[PDB]
Structure 1
Amino acid sequence: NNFYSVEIGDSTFTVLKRYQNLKPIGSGAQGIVCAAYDAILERNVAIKKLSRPFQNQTHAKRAYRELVLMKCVNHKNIIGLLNVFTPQKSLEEFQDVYIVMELMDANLCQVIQMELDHERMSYLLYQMLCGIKHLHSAGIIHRDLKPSNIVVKSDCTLKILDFGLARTTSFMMTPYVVTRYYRAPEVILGMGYKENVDIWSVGCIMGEMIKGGVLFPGTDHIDQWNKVIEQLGTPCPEFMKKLQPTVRTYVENRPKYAGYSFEKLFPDVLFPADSEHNKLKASQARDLLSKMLVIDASKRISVDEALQHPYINVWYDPSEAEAPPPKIPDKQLDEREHTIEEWKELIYKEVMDL
């Protein structure tokens, strides 16, 4: 009727006719999304088909939180929801949900592959921090920030795709994805998390841009942990005291590593080196990496302090950072699970009232 369908993109995508030339743009995301052009809105847009949101309890919780949060967040550095629709009209036969958002040219991983410069690097970091701080203002901690989770346009405008892992992780159900390369020590040591955990992830991403590869490539759960202390160094006594005993021992037992200094971990050679300023801005970068890639989260830099750091403060504009806090509509119980049929009705009602 007012919907048209295409089998291109490996499934029968049904969409309004305003979106046309649907083409696959999937390259690793937990979702198969396709690119499109809207006639009503001049801009080309990207559309996602959510396969069986109510298929299990885990799928629904991810979809329900994404839809409610995307609808109630307005930030330049966080992806926004243009329109949500479902081809089916009946709740009883309701099976699929489509999401349209501002199309971006590539993910941060692809942009990392191209060697960049301090001005573009500082700008990507500045935006990532503003998105995280905007999330923290509403009480949201991501803990799953990765370069495949970050999307960029050709003008270097950065946006964040997903809203992380909600409340809780090294072994998660099929809806979610487990990426350890950028996880903090606390999440890998069960210590507990506060808002500065996301600061650790950006430090691994920032270092990855400079180094050109994953900072801590761990084949498994605990090889990840060995890589962190192998280069950053063995933790100090006050930190290992508070860990629960079954894991405190593994820490005290593993071979002690002095750890390399950031100066040799991130030497000037890879950085731009002809300019003194380029070397100086490198000096501003290495200290920032020293202040966020800290195992004791209590002594790790805060999101607010990172924004006013010399490497990041040049771009400080209150519109991006000091934006009005986001308020979530039916979040009071956003920490609770329910029946699949009840799960099914709520997602339909969140899409059917827009």
Structure 2
Amino acid sequence: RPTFYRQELNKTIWEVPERYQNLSPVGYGSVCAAFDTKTGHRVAVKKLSRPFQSIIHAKRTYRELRLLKHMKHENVIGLLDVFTPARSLEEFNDVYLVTHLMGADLNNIVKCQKLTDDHVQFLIYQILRGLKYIHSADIIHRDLKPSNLAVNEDCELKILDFGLAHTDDEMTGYVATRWYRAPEIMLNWMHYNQTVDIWSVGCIMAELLTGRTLFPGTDHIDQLKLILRLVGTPGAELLKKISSESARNYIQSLAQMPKMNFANVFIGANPLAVDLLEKMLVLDSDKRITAAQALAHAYFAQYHDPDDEPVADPYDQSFESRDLLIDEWKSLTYDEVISFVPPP
């Protein structure tokens, strides 16, 4: 066990190992920037807020720790360390998570840069490379958007901030929290799956090509109208897959519209980029291109290497259907803190 030291920083007590120095507040938890003397990295240290206050919160704490401990890929955020100052389960209360300190996100470049087609190729390639890995473990990210993508000076990218299961108020009105969501999840049409993440990638790629949000709806219904104008209204085949009779009735109340010509929407774009967008932005999720298929599309010919696009170790999510008491979720979390082994 390392030696810990205590300090109060902005109304919060932080008790951390001596290896972490020069803690400075930066913003579910409070976060400090620090220098990690063991690795030489600048890190983000997050102290979880009330991690075990309810059954729901305790299970969410376990879910987050399990997911971060599993992710080991160049294009996905990983876990550098996890610690508690507690010496036993009896006194266990606080959980701290340590990751690489990230600088700019894809907003801090999409708004502030001139991107060549080569830049778009490399950024989208890296998102899809990380997504192939994520999806191979049967994980769905659910919240892909520019603020959840970290990018450095060399245009290298990492996916972060996995969806841990966003509120009703957060999805309401003219908000970026909804502009990247697939229509079947935005309107609760059907049980969703990993194909929702590919819709999000299409929305991101379009914005890198044009500099503008693809579907900036003022509310759920306005956003659906923008979507259907581009991709067309559904046919009977997709309508059969929508579970709610009212939702089907609402859709059938709209006048039918054909899919638009994407070359006349994304004026001047690389024809191979236009082709890939038509394969991602498909209303019926069953018919969208997958991450593994998209990596082999000709748009990425200069970056695709099928011997350097790895998959994940199997990920057991059976805990998600398990019913446990607060202290049982807490004990499982404690076991995962104690068993952590750092990366090389």
TM over 0.5: same fold?
A: yes
3-state SS of paired residue (2:158): strand
Counterpart residue number, 1:93:
91
Distance in 2, matches of 1:210 and 1:178, equals: 18
Instruction: Say whether 1:192 aligns with 2:168.
Output: no
The Cα of 1:109 is off from its aligned counterpart by: 2.2
User: 1:21 aligns to what?
Assistant: 22
Indicate how the Cα distance of structure 1 residues 209 and 327 shifts in structure 2: closer, same or farther if over 3 A, else same: same
Q: Is the Cα contact below 8 Å between 2:64 and 2:164 reproduced in 1? A: no
- Residues 137 and 313 of structure 2 are in contact (CA less than 8 Å); yes or no, is this contact kept in structure 1? yes
Deviation at 1:319?
5.3
Distance across 1 between alignment mates of 2:29 and 2:212: 24
8 Å Cα contact 2:215-2:226 kept in structure 1: yes
What is the distance in 2 between the residues matched to 1:151 and 1:84? 21
The DSSP-based 3-state class of the residue aligned with 1:180 is helix
Q: Which amino acid aligns with 2:330?
A: K
> Contact 1:216–1:224 at 8 Å: present in 2 too?
yes
In the superposition, relative to structure 1, how do residues 75 and 157 fare at CA in structure 2: closer, same or farther (>3 Å)? same
Letter of the aligned partner of 1:305 in structure 2? Q
Kindly state the Cα deviation for residue 172 of structure 1 after the two structures are TM-superposed: 9.0
Judged with a 3 Å threshold, the aligned counterparts in structure 2 of structure 1 residues 93 and 115 are, in CA distance, closer, same or farther, namely farther
Give 3-state SS (helix, strand or coil) of 2:46's partner: strand
Alignment partner, residue 325 of structure 1: 312
- Indicate if the aligned counterparts of 1:4 and 1:16 stay in contact, CA closer than 8 A: yes
- Tell me, yes or no, if structure 1 residue 40 matches structure 2 residue 41: no
Take 1:156 and 1:219, find their aligned partners in 2: how far apart are those partners?
Answer: 32
Q: 1:85 offset after TM fit, Å? A: 0.3
Measured against aligned partners, the alpha-carbon deviations of 1:277-327 in whole angstroms (never above 9, x if no partner) come to xx5xx2211111111011012222122221111112321234542x24323
CA distance in 2 between partners of 1:319 and 1:20 (Å): 40
Q: Which runs of 5+ in 2 are unaligned?
A: none
In the other structure, the counterpart of 2:120 is: 121
Aligned to 2:330: 344
CA deviation vs aligned residue, 1:60-89 (integer Å, no higher than 9, x gap): 333212212221231111111111001232
- Per mean C-alpha deviation after superposition, the further-off stretch among 4-13 and 287-296 is 4-13
Q: C-alpha distance in 2, partners of 1:264/1:14?
A: 58
Q: 8 Å contact 1:170–1:221 — kept in the other structure?
A: no
1:4/1:58 Cα in 2 relative to 1: closer, same or farther (>3 Å)? same
Between 88-97 and 48-57, report the one with greater CA deviation: 88-97
Matched with 2:216 is: 217
> Partner residue of 1:7?
8
Q: Whole-Å Cα distance in 1 between the matches of residues 46 and 91 of structure 2?
A: 20
Q: CA deviation at 1:10?
A: 5.5
CA distance in 2, matches of 1:165, 1:308: 30
1:99-138 C-alpha deviation (Å, 9 max, x unpaired): 1112222222223223322222211111111111111111
- Amino acid of the residue matched to residue 100 of structure 2? E
* Separation in 2, partners of 1:178, 1:352: 38
C-alpha spacing 1:264/1:217, structure 2 compared with 1 (3 Å): same
Tell me the residue number matched to 2:63: 65
Q: Report Cα offsets for 1:234-274 as digits up to 9, x if no partner.
A: 22332223323221110010244446432232112xxxxxx
Query: Bigger shift: 244-253 or 220-229?
Result: 220-229
Q: State the distance in 2 between where 1:197 and 1:135 align.
A: 13
The answer to whether the 8 Å contact 1:61/1:337 transfers is no
Residue type at the aligned position of 2:298:
P
Q: Structure 1 residues 241, 210: closer, same or farther in 2, change over 3 A?
A: same
Please list every run of 5 or more consecutive structure 1 residues that lacks an aligned counterpart in the other structure.
269-278
* Aligned-partner Cα distance in 2 for 1:145–1:111: 16
Number of the residue aligned with 2:150? 151
Q: Which residue does the alignment assign to 1:335?
A: 321
* SS, match of residue 12 in structure 1: strand
1:290 is aligned, of 278, 294, 297, to 278
Q: Which residue of 2 aligns with 1:234?
A: 233
In 2: Cα distance, 1:116 partner to 1:5 partner: 46
Distance in 2 of aligned mates of 1:324 and 1:230: 36
Please state whether the residue corresponding to 2:82 is helix, strand or coil: strand
The reply on whether 1:203 has 2:202 as its aligned counterpart is: yes
Question: How far did 1:9 drift?
Answer: 5.3
Cα distance change, pair 298–115 in 1 and its aligned pair in 2 (3 A): same
Q: Could you tell me whether the CA contact under 8 Å between 2:263 and 2:271 is conserved in 1?
A: no
Deviates more, 1:246-255 or 1:5-14: 5-14
After superposition, residues 110-189 of structure 1 pair within 5 angstroms as 110-113=108-111, 114-165=113-164, 171=168, 179-189=177-187
2:50 to 28, 40, 52: 52
* Amino acid in the other structure paired with 1:24: P
**1:23 alignment partner AA:** S
Q: Distance in 2 between matches of 1:219 and 1:340?
A: 40
Aligned Cα root-mean-square deviation (Å): 2.7
Identity in percent: 49
Are 2:299 and 1:311 equivalent residues in the alignment? yes
**What is the one-letter code of the residue matched to 2:8?**
E
